[PDB]
Amino acid sequence: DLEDNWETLNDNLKVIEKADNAAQVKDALTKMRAAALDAQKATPPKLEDKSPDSPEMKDFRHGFDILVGQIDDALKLANEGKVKEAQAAAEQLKTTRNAYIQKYLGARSASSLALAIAITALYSAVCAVGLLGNVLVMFGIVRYTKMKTATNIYIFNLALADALATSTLPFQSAKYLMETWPFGELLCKAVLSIDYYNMFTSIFTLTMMSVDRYIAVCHPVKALDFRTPAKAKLINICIWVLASGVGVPIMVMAVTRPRDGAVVCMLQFPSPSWYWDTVTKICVFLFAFVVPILIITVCYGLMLLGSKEKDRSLRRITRMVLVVVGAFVVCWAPIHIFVIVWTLVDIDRRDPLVVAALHLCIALGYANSSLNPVLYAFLDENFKRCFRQLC
């Protein structure tokens, strides 16, 4: 609410500095005076919850009574037609603002801190699970010769992308808490492109697992030729190369720049950025979400259409993939919707309940990576055994 008011002071100030007449100068002043009075009413973060009559609080409030006074002065001039004089008077109050009140602003809200700590918690929590949980999955598959299944080789691929994903989390946590990116450009590039690799390689593998189940079920004759592990490895590598059609351009495009007191990691789309940004944001929604989903739904639709333990086994393994597919969807469906709203429907983007909910369901996205290894070891018996065998 206050930074909003401080925003309109600054903005109206430079409207006066670019003005050509008394009316439009006057109007601007009259806005600032309102801004400065609703700002005076407000308590700022540096003064989190001091005595409503502490020296520092009395002193902050004073700064505004001063500023207002000066606005009523400039407004007396503009009223009398004295434009330039009103403009000069406006110049001196930018300073009088900064000299007195500015020392009270800039700090982070206690709520905001709480969010940051809450995130760091969840992140650390996800991170400790997923990073562990998928290193196990990756270790378990390679080590034990008994585990080289076509579908399991695809899982390896997921456990890899998920692992890589969950290695970036503490860096994001530190970025949130300390309000800056202290890790340098290379690692900025590393972290973002990893975040994109994670989305595509996952959803492409999950499409190919689905394609895999389908040929398994509906074309068991044909399957024997295409359902080998060596080939799954090949498709895994294809999934990665293909994904690099989106991952490498981000690798280059991602960069580190200083902005308004901090260092921030971000994407740099060739101008127009806001357009190309949307372009990509749509493609990621189509080609890493709906379009692969439609394929999966088809694959699964068709399977609605042999020995004792093998028929039971297919069912169990097939039913596993649907859950991980579904579990995936429900984790990412929230955030993929939110981002498309965020970048098309102009809602209110600074609200507590909004920002939190966004962050609190980006978190769900990343929670998908810690969930996976659990689902593997609770819906696959061989995984269930291995995980409680170790310890």
Binding site: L192, D195, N198, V264, C265, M266, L267, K281, I335, G365
Partner: peptide, 4 residues
């Protein structure tokens, strides 16, 4: 995902 996502970011600036």
């Amino acid at each position: 995902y996502x970011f600036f």
